[PDB]
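can u pls check wat happens w/ potassium ion
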Amino acid sequence: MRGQKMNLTFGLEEVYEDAEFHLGDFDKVGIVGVNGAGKTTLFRLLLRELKLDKGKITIGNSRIGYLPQEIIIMDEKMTVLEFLAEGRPIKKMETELNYIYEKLTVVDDDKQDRLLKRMGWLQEQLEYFDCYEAESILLDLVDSMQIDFDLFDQPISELSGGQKSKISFAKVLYSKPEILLLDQPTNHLDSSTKEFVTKYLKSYRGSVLIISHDIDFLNQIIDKIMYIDKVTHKISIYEGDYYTYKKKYSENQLLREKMIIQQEKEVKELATFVQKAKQASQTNHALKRMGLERAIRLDKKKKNLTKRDKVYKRVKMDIKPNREVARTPLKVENVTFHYPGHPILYKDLSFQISGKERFLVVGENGVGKSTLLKLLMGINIPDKGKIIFNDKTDVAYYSQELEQLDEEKTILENVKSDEYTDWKLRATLSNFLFYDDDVNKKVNVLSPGEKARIVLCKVLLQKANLLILDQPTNHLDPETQSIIGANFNLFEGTIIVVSHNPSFVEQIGINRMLILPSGNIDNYSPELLEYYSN
Amino acid sequence: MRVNITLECTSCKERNYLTNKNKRNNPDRLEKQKYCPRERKVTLHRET
RNA sequence: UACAUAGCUGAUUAGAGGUAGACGCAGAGAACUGAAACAUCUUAGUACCUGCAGGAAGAGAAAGAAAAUUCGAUUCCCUGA
RNA sequence: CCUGAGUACGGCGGAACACGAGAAAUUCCGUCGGAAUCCGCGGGGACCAUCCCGCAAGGCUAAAUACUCCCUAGUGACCGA
RNA sequence: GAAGAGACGGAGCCGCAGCGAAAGCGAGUCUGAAUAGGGCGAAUGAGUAUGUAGUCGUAGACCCGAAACCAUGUGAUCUA
RNA sequence: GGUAGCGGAGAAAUUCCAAACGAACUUGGAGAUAGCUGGUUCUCUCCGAAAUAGCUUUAGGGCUAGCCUCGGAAUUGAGAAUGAUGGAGGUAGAGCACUGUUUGGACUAGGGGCCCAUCUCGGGUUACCGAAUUCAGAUAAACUCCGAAUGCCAUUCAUUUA
RNA sequence: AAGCGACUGUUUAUCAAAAACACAGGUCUCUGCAAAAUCGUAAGAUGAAGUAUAGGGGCUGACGCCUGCCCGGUGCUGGAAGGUUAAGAGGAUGGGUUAGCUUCGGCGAAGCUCAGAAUUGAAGCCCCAGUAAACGGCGGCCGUAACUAUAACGGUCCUAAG
RNA sequence: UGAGUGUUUGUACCACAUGUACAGGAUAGGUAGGAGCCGAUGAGACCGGAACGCUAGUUUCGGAGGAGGCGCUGGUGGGAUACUACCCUUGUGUUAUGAACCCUCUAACCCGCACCACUAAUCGUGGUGGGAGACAGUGUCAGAUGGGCAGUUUGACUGGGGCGGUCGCCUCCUAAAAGGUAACGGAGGCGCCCAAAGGUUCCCUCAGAAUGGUUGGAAAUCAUUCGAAGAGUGUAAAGGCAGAAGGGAGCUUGACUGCGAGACCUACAAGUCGAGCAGGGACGAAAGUCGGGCUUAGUGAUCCGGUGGUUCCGCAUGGAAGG
RNA sequence: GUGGUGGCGAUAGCGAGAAGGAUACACCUGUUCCCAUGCCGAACACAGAAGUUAAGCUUCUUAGCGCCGAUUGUAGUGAAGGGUUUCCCUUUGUGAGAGUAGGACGUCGCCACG
RNA sequence: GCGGGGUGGAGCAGUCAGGUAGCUCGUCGGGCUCAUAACCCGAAGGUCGUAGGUUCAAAUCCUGCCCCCGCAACCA
RNA sequence: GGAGGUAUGACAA
Ligand SMILES: Nc1ncnc2c1ncn2[C@@H]1O[C@H](COP(=O)(O)OP(=O)(O)OP(=O)(O)O)[C@@H](O)[C@H]1O
Ligand SMILES: Nc1ncnc2c1ncn2[C@@H]1O[C@H](COP(=O)(O)OP(=O)(O)OP(=O)(O)O)[C@@H](O)[C@H]1O
Ligand SMILES: [K+]
Ligand SMILES: [K+]
Ligand SMILES: [K+]
Ligand SMILES: [K+]
Ligand SMILES: [K+]
Ligand SMILES: [K+]
Ligand SMILES: [K+]
Ligand SMILES: [K+]
Ligand SMILES: [K+]
Ligand SMILES: [K+]
Ligand SMILES: [K+]
Ligand SMILES: [K+]
Ligand SMILES: [K+]
Ligand SMILES: [K+]
Ligand SMILES: [K+]
Ligand SMILES: [K+]
Ligand SMILES: [K+]
Ligand SMILES: [K+]
Ligand SMILES: [K+]
Ligand SMILES: [K+]
Ligand SMILES: [K+]
Ligand SMILES: [K+]
Ligand SMILES: [K+]
Ligand SMILES: [K+]
Ligand SMILES: [K+]
Ligand SMILES: [K+]
Ligand SMILES: [K+]
Ligand SMILES: [K+]
Ligand SMILES: [K+]
Ligand SMILES: [K+]
Ligand SMILES: [K+]
Ligand SMILES: [K+]
Ligand SMILES: [K+]
Ligand SMILES: [K+]
Ligand SMILES: [K+]
Ligand SMILES: [Mg+2]
Ligand SMILES: [Mg+2]
Ligand SMILES: [Mg+2]
Ligand SMILES: [Mg+2]
Ligand SMILES: [Mg+2]
Ligand SMILES: [Mg+2]
Ligand SMILES: [Mg+2]
Ligand SMILES: [Mg+2]
Ligand SMILES: [Mg+2]
Ligand SMILES: [Mg+2]
Ligand SMILES: [Mg+2]
Ligand SMILES: [Mg+2]
Ligand SMILES: [Mg+2]
Ligand SMILES: [Mg+2]
Ligand SMILES: [Mg+2]
Ligand SMILES: [Mg+2]
Ligand SMILES: [Mg+2]
Ligand SMILES: [Mg+2]
Ligand SMILES: [Mg+2]
Ligand SMILES: [Mg+2]
Ligand SMILES: [Mg+2]
Ligand SMILES: [Mg+2]
Ligand SMILES: [Mg+2]
Ligand SMILES: [Mg+2]
Ligand SMILES: [Mg+2]
Ligand SMILES: [Mg+2]
Ligand SMILES: [Mg+2]
Ligand SMILES: [Mg+2]
Ligand SMILES: [Mg+2]
Ligand SMILES: [Mg+2]
Ligand SMILES: [Mg+2]
Ligand SMILES: [Mg+2]
Ligand SMILES: [Mg+2]
Ligand SMILES: [Zn+2]
């Protein structure tokens, strides 16, 4: 993998400017960058989905296993087995091969040469992708992540976010690839599932490029770290782990900063002398002469004076509730719910939040965490029981899968609210790093991370006193995650949160944790690990 | 930002026309129905 | 230092130096000047210096010129321009 | 069986070819690397194939050519203190 | 051949065809999709060898004049 | 006796190195170069400038054009002068129709302090200050409702001329 | 009686004899000997037939009392993890040619050939520390006491230090 | 410029070991052959050791003993059983090694060390020790540093020169009613902008003032009247435009291709305008308009280089390189 | 007489007043129709003929404004001269602007209905 | 003419690179103290010199204007 | 029991 003079500019906002990178074979490369840096775009170039405006991107002929950042569900009714089976080209070739046979009967002596060649390639290709895979896939689920077979016959769209990530990850492995392009492979996974992925990737003998915002996950796997710069629009490749990249990077910007300081001092020195000559008497010929001579040096300095790159601005969140919380924001009493045709998730579930409380809904993948939150909002109607919100409680919902955005509309159109004027919307969008005509961009072209900011901005603009957040730190770059956690910690309201990120929950400072599926309203503590272990 | 640009004929890949556009006002590649002298007929020309 | 060799002695041999302020070959090799400035370039491989010469020197008997199909060492003059 | 080896040639750095590295052959110098040998080798202006021409890395060779310090005999719309 | 004229020597040069960057075509040719227009040409012809004079180019180039630059040499009998 | 010029020597002054040293002297390149100064030699005849435009590391230089001279070709004679006729243009002058500058008068929105009334609400006042309007009066290179004399362009025109 | 220079000396032969140079003394720094330094392409010399109490270089200039603050910048000295970096080594890939295949198509082995990335690659530079008798540098604004002035004193900005 | 040691590494053979997913007799690497094969050259079964191990077992070593097993066959599975070959993963070693470093060696090279001879000799050349040593020195190439040294550059206008200002382009006044016309004369602008703020068809007419009118005020939006331009015309000024060039809507891309009689301007190079012809279009019923924008600034010669196209050339020829 | 449609510098206009609809033109009645209003059949579009000259429109009166504008004189000025020469004057030719006498409430055509 | 500055009472940030008016001292009120100082707790104090543009949005960008400071305003 | 060592506060009253 090699790229030379890479250039890419979508409209007015550019991604790569004379960027270059060389990746040696058998390198577990960790791709790192802020949201929007262009990490996903790099894979699209490797997959030939995109074409560089200028420059050459060179890829090896080996087969590539691509794990998209977003799950590709062509149809809602697709079953898990259908989704996985599509990983291999067995089905596609057979449909083509079956047609070839039909043509052979119809055509006698005209197209036989072309048909025979096509049939031969399909047979050779089919045997190359040995048709015994039908059995191998069935057991790949068992050995991979303990994926139950009941899911195997279920529509994929109905799976949980963590479950979908397992299926998508398994599909990549099912394809039997030669180069691994993993785009956030652990976005929704729980702690246990992440362990399997880490171990497999450590053992994987081939090249694997990983786009991840999990530093610890990368450190265990990565041997080479590729940093996509958002301000310089360039690529830099370091040897080592995430920390090594930060150490090397922080030093380079420090050494660059000191260079710019000294160049400014020399310019100021000349400038100061030029001014002294400029204001001297016209009768002081020698000083006037020297002033013009130094004016020439000053001009040449100012033309070779390196510009300091504008440090990328970090998100600023100020979430405040309009109204005040009550002692009983939310009442859940004897609530039972089951998805038609599936086991009851919880029976007679009853809890009561206190107000300005950090309430954590703990659990594992596919246990009902997101179902419970959907239950509170009203998306799901409880099979039994009642859910009562105090009249003082305003609720803001952050869905897990980013289902609250219109892909067709623009950023500004999405955030449009009856309670906010235009400039008010722009100011907040600037706090979320959407500057000027960046707000007229269609939501369909944004990255998952940039979309997550829009959803958060919608939550902020509500000014609700109860925050129902379902994995808020998902898709966010590590810097933005800490800002999110720190600001929520200071939030003066009740927070119902779900998060598989240990760091984020620590910053928020959880008070009570609700374990699933075994309903257990408990005081928050390092005993969370005990429930996870058990 | 206003920049000079070239309109290439889609049919023949011929860079027939030179023009200019404001990137901010027209982020997407400009497309016009212009006469292609090589093909001697109107064709779709897209910026490159 | 043993054989030797080196040194030393003798005999034998052929060089030294000068020109014709010319001509030839070679080593080394400027600057003013021109470019309307100036560094690449030009003056110029010139002036100067040094070596070797001969009456001439140098070159010369194709691992060539060509592609009319062919020519048949070298040198010099006309022409190509 | 013989037909010129640390050679031809190549990299690097210079130089000579009208040709200033240029697409640049051809020739030479220094340094390093470094062939084939008749089914072989070189050249025909990068390079390759075909075709044509030639046979390097050894030597010698008169004449046509350059010059006149001198000697002999003359010449001049050359000088005339 | 007298340091001559002259004789031989037709290799070569100029002119008799131009247009186009070039392939190329030719009283035309180039541009152009074009029998269009337009450009340059032909229609609408005089050249060439030599003498002479004017002017120009290369040469010191109408004559005299630097401060200087460069390359061999000669100078410490004054003076340090 | 030694140190020699791309140098020497210097208790240091650019000081000395054969009577002038910010780089000795002599010969050669060499007739260096000099957009600079000086000089450039007989006669008569015909005609006779320019000191301007443009560009220029250009400004006391140069190039093209303009102006002079010599020869030639050709024309529906195209030049000059004057007249007749027709036109383009905004100057002198003048004017205020616009735009600026501006004087006095009338009226006045409005603004100023005085008191009553103050919830500062309404007066009544300075021949208080006063926009706009209006009357009268000026003013203009970068004002014009107007507008010459002249000059200019042109005419198959006329007369004279070349 | 004052300035300058401690002093005797030296200097612009030929407009300057001096406060200029030298000087003894001070200090810094280089130099372990085929020393450093210098002349020279080299050989060979001086240094020195000397050896750190010696030799070279910079500054200051008897003697007496003293010689404050700043190592941020520039030099020098030391450091060696990291970044950057030449030739050379290396040779993944991509062109040119064509034996051969080929569905006008087009593909294409070997050889030769034109380019060539990864990787490797010293010093230096960046970086860290020290060094001022190394090159150098050595601040502002506002307010305060019993008349008034002034400010011992108080704020605050800047700097490597004021 | 040559020997070794060791270390860390890259390569290549050669030995070794390893292959357990579901089913499957069970630890099934792939392919090919395979009915037959192996064992008194010590088989089966048994026992101990060791290894691997997915914990199920597999491999190997040995004690005794002595003759046997395995395969085919059979069912499983996608794949079948022995054994052979070709190999393929994984991790052990041997060898060949190639590098990087490590020191050690000695014979090259070096000695302004000692002694010996040439020999009168502080030169030199040899000889013997000693020291050092593949370093150093030297050659070629490369980076760094390098006023120590060298060749040069370091504007012009200008009420002298300096300082300040200016240098190209557009508009006005100066400018003397054609055009042109200077000053370091008086004023300003430009180095763009517009995907409509372009084209076309259709449609519309402004600024202000008075009166009335919730929030609402001098002044937001609304209505009548008065209103010839006192508005607007992207952007300076002048000229022009209300038969619009100002404003709105629909459709569009003529902000076209090849040109171009003839004009203006002009030292040249350039600059400006252009009916009209053809090709193929936009709008409109048609007429007809359209080769950008109300007009006049919004720009830069050549050389050199980049990208794209091309029936052009291609140094014997075909290509190519390069034009 | 009216309605279309043009030429000519508004001497054609504007303001004010008066008269007329027989036809014609208009207002005028409606929105089902093609068609339409960034809302509105107001407008545009279409259908239609109950009423009215009220307005527009036509004709007529008026010089209030606007417009046109002779002559005389003057400013300037070409040419030729002068002076006491930043200016001024004379001869000759030309001659405004302003201010006025006055002009003028249009004229010249074609069509269709009368 | 050349520069530097106008942000709460004072000294300063912010400004380059448009989104949110801060830091130090001070003032006011209340605490602590026998009282004062220090200290502790609350509060006030600017729409960024001013007027216009640019922008969805200006302390920030553009133009002008007014103030304050240093310098210059002439050389043989 | 003894001995040598290890922040501010006029003045008078
Ligand atoms: N078709 C597009 N049009 C306009 N902008 C685009 C388009 N595609 C991508 N961009 C921009 O490219 C930028 C970077 O691309 P990319 O989506 O790969 O970022 P990312 O690092 O992968 O995001 P994240 O890490 O949060 O998943 C995005 O901010 C996105 O706004
Ligand atoms: N619309 C649905 N239809 C049918 N079954 C569903 C549906 N949604 C969820 N399920 C099932 O509910 C179970 C849990 O629901 P839920 O989406 O809340 O999982 P979760 O707690 O969010 O897990 P995680 O977020 O970690 O992936 C899943 O197994 C999932 O298969
Ligand atoms: K001679
Ligand atoms: K020269
Ligand atoms: K010159
Ligand atoms: K010879
Ligand atoms: K060459
Ligand atoms: K040849
Ligand atoms: K040959
Ligand atoms: K033609
Ligand atoms: K023609
Ligand atoms: K003749
Ligand atoms: K002649
Ligand atoms: K001469
Ligand atoms: K001459
Ligand atoms: K002497
Ligand atoms: K002296
Ligand atoms: K006026
Ligand atoms: K005027
Ligand atoms: K002295
Ligand atoms: K002294
Ligand atoms: K003293
Ligand atoms: K004296
Ligand atoms: K002296
Ligand atoms: K002292
Ligand atoms: K000293
Ligand atoms: K010093
Ligand atoms: K001393
Ligand atoms: K310092
Ligand atoms: K320092
Ligand atoms: K090949
Ligand atoms: K060596
Ligand atoms: K003067
Ligand atoms: K339009
Ligand atoms: K109606
Ligand atoms: K009426
Ligand atoms: K009238
Ligand atoms: Mg992404
Ligand atoms: Mg969930
Ligand atoms: Mg020159
Ligand atoms: Mg002889
Ligand atoms: Mg040459
Ligand atoms: Mg060589
Ligand atoms: Mg060759
Ligand atoms: Mg032959
Ligand atoms: Mg001869
Ligand atoms: Mg004589
Ligand atoms: Mg005589
Ligand atoms: Mg001598
Ligand atoms: Mg002597
Ligand atoms: Mg001096
Ligand atoms: Mg002398
Ligand atoms: Mg010469
Ligand atoms: Mg005469
Ligand atoms: Mg006047
Ligand atoms: Mg003295
Ligand atoms: Mg004395
Ligand atoms: Mg003297
Ligand atoms: Mg004297
Ligand atoms: Mg001194
Ligand atoms: Mg110099
Ligand atoms: Mg020179
Ligand atoms: Mg000058
Ligand atoms: Mg002056
Ligand atoms: Mg004029
Ligand atoms: Mg005139
Ligand atoms: Mg317009
Ligand atoms: Mg060829
Ligand atoms: Mg050839
Ligand atoms: Mg009149
Ligand atoms: Zn085309």
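The first strand of chain A starts at residue 2 and ends at 10.
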